[PDB]
Symmetry: none
């Protein structure tokens, strides 16, 4: 169906995903999949059917 997204903004400031680490020993940073960001952000029908977004993180450390 119709999906109207109107917008009349002014001086719009947007930050998306942020991350900060410090003085750690090990570091992992996995990001993605459907990360949309912006003054007019739209994300329609990210997954349909048998599709998958397996944004996993297999941290094992098999000590």
């Amino acid at each position: 169906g119709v999906l109207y997204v109107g917008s009349k903004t002014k001086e719009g400031v947007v930050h998306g995903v942020a991350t900060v680490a410090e003085k750690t020993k090990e570091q992992v940073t996995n990001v993605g999949g459907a990360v949309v960001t912006g003054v007019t952000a739209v994300a329609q029908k990210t997954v349909e059917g048998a599709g998958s977004i397996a944004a996993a993180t297999g941290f094992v450390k098999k000590d």
Copy 2:
């Protein structure tokens, strides 16, 4: 069906996902799937059918 999203804003400031760590030993940061962000954020029909978003984090540490 119809989905109208009107907006007349002014001086809009938006922060999305934030994360802060400090003085840790191990660090993991998994983000994503359907992270939408913005002054006019829309997210319609993220998953339909047999689809999946398995944003897991298999932290094992098999000590």
Copy 3:
């Protein structure tokens, strides 16, 4: 169906994915999949059918 995205902005500032590490020992940075970003961001039908976005990170450290 129709998907109208109108926008009349002015002085729009957008930051997408950010990441900061410091004084760590090991470092990993995996990003992607469907990272969209901008003053007018649109992301329609990222995955359809048997498709997949396996943005994983196989950190093992098989010590």
Copy 4:
């Protein structure tokens, strides 16, 4: 002596002298002398010594 005028404003709207006439027969409009106007208006020492500001209006109509 010192005359400090500090100001940190935002979205300031100022109107100065206004005048409206309607359906009259005769019309006179004398303005001036020291008409200062603005978001940061200052008017120091307008008249000193034998000076004068004779903003008169000699409407006579010597009928």
Copy 5:
């Protein structure tokens, strides 16, 4: 002496002298002398000594 005029404004709108007439028979419009106007308006020492600002209007109509 020192005369400091600081200002940190944003989106300042200023109107100075205004005048409106309608359906009149005779019309006169005298303006001036020291008409200062603006977001940072300053008017120092407009008249000094034997000076004069005779912004008059000799409407006679010697009928």
Copy 6:
């Protein structure tokens, strides 16, 4: 003496002298003398000594 005029503005709109007439029979419009106007308007020492600004309007109509 020192006369400091600092200003850090943004999106400043200024109108100076305005005048509107309509459906009149006779029309006169005298303007001037020291009409200063602007986002940073300054007018120092407009008249000094025996000087004069005789912005008059000798409307007689010696009927």
